[PDB]
Amino acid sequence: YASLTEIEHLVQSVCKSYRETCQLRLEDLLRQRSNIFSREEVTGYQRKSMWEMWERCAHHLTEAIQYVVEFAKRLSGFMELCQNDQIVLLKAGAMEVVLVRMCRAYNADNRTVFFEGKYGGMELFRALGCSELISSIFDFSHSLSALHFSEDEIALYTALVLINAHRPGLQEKRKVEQLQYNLELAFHHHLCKTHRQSILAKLPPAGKLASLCSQHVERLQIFQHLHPIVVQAAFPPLYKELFS
Amino acid sequence: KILHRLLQE
């Protein structure tokens, strides 16, 4: 892009796509912070079977991914890429975007996340048998939350998470690069304008998101090997398309 | 497949 007016238009446009595609409004999440699972409800979650809690989490991830697909669809540049590259970007990026969007549902004051109508701590997911992954996700959401990420910042940051020209498989790499660089300009322009450039150094390191995605795939492979019929019969087709 | 349908609709 040439001149601040085109960069600023991009900023507004990305922010709007984000707002239209966020699954939950931020104030609905904040208004729920006192609604916390009782110890008896926690125990109830801990006693659920591994396979049932996997299914539930997969369903919830699938719904979050659907909103990310709509996000990508509303970024003009994205829909200008060829279909192969759309899919490449979404298969590598969708989970990473959800993982970023989850910080909004995380309360750093008590280390809880909004899940199925109330806030609960990481002990809520014990039945999954992936304590390392869960703990890493909670830690990631705590990092971002410490930054006090604004809605506008999440918009712009998650547009960049998705439009990543380093994804293996991209055919029009140069085109993705151009889009990535215009979105980087937009993000950094907005940071500069809002006096928020101090967060650049505090953003999680490159590959952190990749590490969570790969743990997620690795824990999935173990679960699937234990319960292959559950995955086939009861995991969402989109989920399996992105991760199996 | 599902992605291709979500991107097309």
d(CA A16, CA A62): 23
CATH number at residue A16: 1.10.565.10
* B5 in reach of chain A (CB within 8 A): no
DSSP-based three-state secondary structure for A220: helix
Residues of B in contact with A241 (CB under 8 A): 1-3
- The distance in angstroms from the start CA to the end CA of chain B is 12
> B1, B3, B4, B9: best mutation site toward chain A, by most A Cβ within 10 Å?
B3
| Token pair belonging to A89 | 């970007």
| Token pair belonging to A105 | 């549902």
| Token pair belonging to A31 | 């208004």
**Residue carrying the six token digits 């450039």:** A197
Phi, psi (5° rounding) for residue A208? -65, -45
**Residue carrying the six token digits 């239209």:** A20
The whole-angstrom distance between A56's CA and the closest CA on chain B is 20
Resolution of this model in Å is 2.3
Phi, psi (5° rounding) for residue A191? -55, -45
d(CA A96, CA A71): 13
d(CA A232, CA A58): 12
Q: How far out from the chain centre does Cα A18 lie?
A: 12
> A62, A63, A69, A84: best mutation site toward chain B, by most B Cβ within 10 Å?
A69
DSSP per-residue letters across A159-218? HHHHS-TT-TT-SSHHHHHHHHHHHHHHHHHHHHHTT-GGGGGGSPPTTHHHHHHHHHHH
* A83 in reach of chain B (CB within 8 A): yes
* B7 in reach of chain A (CB within 8 A): yes
d(CA B5, CA A238): 11
Q: Which residues contact A4 (CB under 8 A, 6 or more apart)?
A: A189
Q: Which DSSP helix (H) or strand (E) runs through A112?
A: strand A112-115
Q: Which residues contact A200 (CB under 8 A, 6 or more apart)?
A: A188, A191
Q: Which residues contact A162 (CB under 8 A, 6 or more apart)?
A: A68, A71, A72, A75, A78, A89, A90, A93, A94, A96, A97
In DSSP terms, which residues pair with A118 in a beta bridge? A115
The number of domains in chain A is 1
C-alpha pair distances (Å), A170 with each of A81, A159, A165, A173? 10, 17, 8, 6
Phi-psi region of A116 (alpha: psi -120 to 50; beta: other; left: phi over 0): left
d(CA A45, CA A192): 44
**Residue carrying the six token digits 């090997």:** A225
Structural domain for A60, as ranges: 1-244
The whole-angstrom distance between B5's CA and the closest CA on chain A is 11
Helix %, strand %, coil % of chain A (to 5): 75, 5, 25
Cross-chain residue pair B1–A69, CB shorter than 8 Å = no
Task: Write down the experimental method used for this entry.
Answer: X-ray
d(CA A93, CA A186): 19
Q: Which residues contact A164 (CB under 8 A, 6 or more apart)?
A: A89, A92, A93, A176, A180
C-alpha pair distances (Å), A181 with each of A9, A13, A221, A240? 15, 16, 35, 32
* B6 in reach of chain A (CB within 8 A): yes
Cross-chain residue pair A241–B7, CB shorter than 8 Å = no
The conformation of residue A235, written as its DSSP 8-state character, comes to S
- The distance in angstroms from the start CA to the end CA of chain A is 39
Cross-chain residue pair A242–B1, CB shorter than 8 Å = no
In DSSP terms, which residues pair with A113 in a beta bridge? A106, A120
Cross-chain residue pair B6–A66, CB shorter than 8 Å = yes
d(CA A227, CA A220): 10
d(CA A201, CA A4): 24
